[PDB]
Design a protein around this ligand. Structure first.
Ligand SMILES: CC(C)c1c(C(=O)Nc2ccccc2)c(-c2ccccc2)c(-c2ccc(F)cc2)n1CC[C@@H](O)C[C@@H](O)CC(=O)O
Ligand SMILES: CC(C)c1c(C(=O)Nc2ccccc2)c(-c2ccccc2)c(-c2ccc(F)cc2)n1CC[C@@H](O)C[C@@H](O)CC(=O)O
Ligand SMILES: CC(C)c1c(C(=O)Nc2ccccc2)c(-c2ccccc2)c(-c2ccc(F)cc2)n1CC[C@@H](O)C[C@@H](O)CC(=O)O
Ligand SMILES: CC(C)c1c(C(=O)Nc2ccccc2)c(-c2ccccc2)c(-c2ccc(F)cc2)n1CC[C@@H](O)C[C@@H](O)CC(=O)O
Ligand SMILES: CC(C)c1c(C(=O)Nc2ccccc2)c(-c2ccccc2)c(-c2ccc(F)cc2)n1CC[C@@H](O)C[C@@H](O)CC(=O)O
Ligand SMILES: Cn1c(=O)c2c(ncn2C)n(C)c1=O
Ligand SMILES: [Ca+2]
Lengths: 519, 146
């Protein structure tokens, strides 16, 4: 019996009101376990593992987790949803293979540029400039280019359609959840007011009047309860006008264009949708000129963590970098002023007589020459102008060259480089520390793997049986499904504290083994 | 044994045996292992460098063909960017080792209509390729050794 029922036994530990740790057993449904294994929820789990420790503080770590547990549930519900029949089947098939379509698009984009690497130019027409191919196998590549370009464009369109059919409802759900939570708990449109710089709330203000405001969010009584809570110290009639609800209705015995406008407005500000639109636009422009396809290669830049870290190292310290380059420009301007006033005769860049090429007869030309040639010289401006030997101003020229070399090349460029290098090193150190801390401690109670492992495989058993993370989400869904009159004492306790958004039932630096170490 | 036997057909093969001194002591082994300590990041970084150089080659081939004449004698020009492959090889082979960027190996853009674009091209190449990526590649190995 135990062997048969092992997969359906869920075990968790909670922190009771009696200031002691308790263990709770419950049932896990077959459908929930089956739905737990879909690829999109795996991607969501990976993304959560990515961001939970990267920026989130230790004080709110539980809260974020709880929010995650909500979103996944909604996803699973919509996952249960998978001539109009043909269209529905086509849309479901598109939604099921979004990441495969993305893989195919990247592969085609990579394949295009290899063929592009064989271009050639000529003045005469192929056997105004003329661009053509030099492939040995005649006719092998010319139609393949067209076929691959058409396939790439089609795949981009399919990816856009799939993303529209898959991820938009989650965004709408999160937006509605945040708006409802903030409005109920803080009354940001009742007592306080949104800031003038916060376009978020200003745009969200349009949807409050909508009859069908909570379309995706489950709580379809938020307006009633917010009216009840904030209708005492404030006028009820104006509150009802603000929410647009009929005050004459109480519990006893066709397009709604405003909501669509709000939905389109909130959709057209999503980063992923805009990125897909830009991808499509570039792919379309690729047909007018082939080389535009090269832009799609940038998709490989953000594909992995290390390259993203390398890219972010530049923008990690932007302000100091900009100020440093401004200081460099000012110093070069001062040097240009001195050179233009005193050393004009040494800037002849013409090797043929009777055709001189002065570089510092104007301030602009001299300044451009100093910023363009002098900085990249490696030895300073002294190795690009005439030899000052035998002149009256020899010592001044020597001091000029030496001081330029010391101040511009040795110091400022080194500082500019070092800023970025140090930022990259610091980012790598932070990532390594985060990974080590994640891999060496229990996520929930925060006890190191050294207290465990005093017995063989103790930490693995603690993380897999007593502290398993998915069991809490299973418990939340189990509480959602069950009736209120059938709740036990512990279940009702947890349900009550959940509805108040208090997270004191999670163990904090304690466990069942530690409490009963002496048995 | 195989190398020693092959040494009789051509003497210089014996030089290969000198590699036995490389692994003979701890310090040289550490120096050798510093290269392979962080291989994956190094390979990804050089791939990124190649991609950036390819983008620069595309831009240069489309707009700046007239500045790539490497022939000092008239009536016998030597174009370097009349093909994509030749331009790409020129950029990866000469530009990276220049020290001052690609700007010091091509013609002077003074007096041309496209002068400012050429200046921005040279400066951006020098900043992104020479200053940053090469320093990161070197620093990885140096930090591994330390
Ligand atoms: C993996 C990468 C190419 C990717 C994908 C994608 O298609 N994933 C993928 C996964 C599995 C198989 C095949 C492809 C999408 C991506 C794009 C659209 C829809 C879904 C995923 C993006 C991305 C680019 C720009 C954006 F503004 C947002 C996301 N990115 C790059 C940026 C990404 O780092 C942003 C964010 O996620 C933070 C982070 O990850 O650190
Ligand atoms: C599986 C992964 C390494 C991969 C490959 C690949 O294996 N190429 C491979 C190819 C042949 C042989 C061997 C390997 C390609 C990949 C790369 C190039 C060509 C084909 C596939 C991608 C990928 C990245 C971004 C895209 F837009 C699309 C796909 N991805 C997906 C990256 C994504 O998961 C990262 C995400 O989980 C976390 C994050 O965002 O940080
Ligand atoms: C644009 C900005 C970064 C900037 C530049 C600049 O021109 N950079 C730039 C560089 C090169 C090209 C183009 C642009 C210079 C700036 C820097 C160096 C040289 C000239 C201007 C300044 C700035 C600095 C000092 C001042 F007294 C006033 C303004 N600022 C504003 C800095 C200010 O925010 C600092 C902050 O600490 C103030 C605070 O704490 O409240
Ligand atoms: C004794 C040692 C320093 C040495 C010499 C030497 O002294 N040359 C010397 C010669 C003349 C005067 C003074 C000194 C030569 C050695 C080197 C060159 C020529 C002759 C002998 C080697 C040695 C190393 C690898 C070989 F295949 C053969 C020998 N070895 C042996 C190294 C070996 O023990 C290392 C091992 O214990 C630990 C490890 O593996 O890390
Ligand atoms: C061969 C391999 C190192 C490689 C290259 C490459 O072409 N290097 C190389 C460099 C120069 C010349 C020759 C070869 C690039 C790679 C790197 C930069 C530019 C082009 C390809 C990638 C790779 C990176 C991101 C992707 F989205 C997909 C594949 N990959 C696979 C990386 C993958 O394992 C990362 C890992 O983090 C995935 C995971 O966590 O599961
Ligand atoms: C669907 N659903 C939830 O997803 C939910 C909930 N209470 C909390 N959550 C997360 N209720 C009552 C609910 O019906
Ligand atoms: Ca009861």
């Amino acid at each position: 019996i135990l062997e048969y029922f092992r997969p359906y036994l869920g075990r968790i530990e909670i922190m009771g009101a009696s200031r002691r740790i308790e263990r709770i057993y419950f049932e896990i449904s077959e459908t929930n376990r089956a739905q737990w294994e879909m690829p999109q929820v795996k991607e969501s789990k990976r993304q959560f593992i990515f961001d939970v420790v990267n920026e989130g503080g230790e004080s709110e770590k539980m809260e974020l987790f709880v929010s995650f547990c909500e979103d996944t549930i909604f996803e699973m519900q919509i996952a249960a949803q998978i001539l109009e029949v043909q269209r529905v089947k086509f849309l479901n098939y598109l939604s099921r293979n979004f990441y495969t379509l993305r893989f195919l698009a990247l592969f085609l984009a990579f394949a295009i540029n290899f063929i592009l690497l064989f271009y050639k130019v000529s003045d005469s027409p192929p056997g105004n400039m003329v661009y053509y191919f030099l492939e040995e196998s005649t006719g092998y590549m010319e139609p393949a280019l067209r076929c691959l370009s058409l396939l790439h464009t089609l795949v981009a369109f399919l990816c856009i359609i799939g993303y529209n059919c898959l991820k938009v409802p989650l965004v709408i759900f999160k937006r509605e959840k945040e708006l409802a939570r903030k409005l109920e708990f803080d009354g940001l449109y009742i007592t306080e007011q949104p800031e003038d710089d916060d376009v978020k709330g200003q745009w969200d203000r349009l949807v409050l009047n909508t009859p069908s405001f909570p379309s995706n969010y489950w709580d379809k009584f938020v307006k009633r309860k917010v009216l009840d809570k904030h209708g005492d110290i404030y006028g009820r009639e104006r509150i009802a006008e603000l929410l647009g609800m009929d005050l004459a209705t109480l519990e006893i015995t066709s397009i709604d264009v405003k909501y669509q406008i709000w939905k389109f407005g909130v959709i057209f500000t999503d980063n992923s949708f805009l990125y897909l639109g830009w991808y499509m636009v570039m792919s379309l422009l690729g047909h007018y000129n082939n080389f535009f396809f090269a832009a799609h290669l940038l998709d490989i830049a953000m594909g992995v963590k290390t390259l993203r870290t390398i890219l972010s190292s530049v923008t990690h310290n932007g302000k100091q970098l900009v100020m440093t380059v401004g200081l460099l420009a000012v110093v070069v301007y001062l040097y240009t002023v001195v050179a233009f006033n005193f050393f004009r005769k040494f800037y002849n860049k013409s090797e043929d007589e009777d055709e001189p090429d002065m570089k510092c007869d104007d301030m602009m030309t001299c300044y451009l020459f100093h910023m363009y040639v002098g900085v990249r010289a490696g030895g300073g401006i002294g190795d690009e102008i005439e030899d000052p030997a035998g002149d009256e101003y020899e010592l001044y020229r020597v001091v000029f060259d030496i001081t330029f070399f010391f101040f511009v090349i040795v110091i400022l460029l080194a500082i500019i480089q070092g800023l970025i290098i140090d930022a990259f090193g610091e980012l790598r150190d932070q990532q390594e520390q985060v990974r080590e801390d994640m891999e060496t401690k229990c996520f929930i109670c925060g006890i190191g793997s050294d207290y465990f492992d005093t017995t063989p495989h103790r930490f693995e058993t603690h993380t897999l049986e007593e502290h398993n993370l998915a069991n809490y989400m299973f418990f939340l869904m189990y509480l959602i499904n069950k009736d209120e009159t059938e709740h036990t004492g512990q279940e009702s306790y947890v349900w009550k504290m959940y509805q108040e958004r208090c997270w004191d039932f999670f163990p904090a630096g304690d466990c069942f083994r530690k409490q009963y170490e002496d048995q």
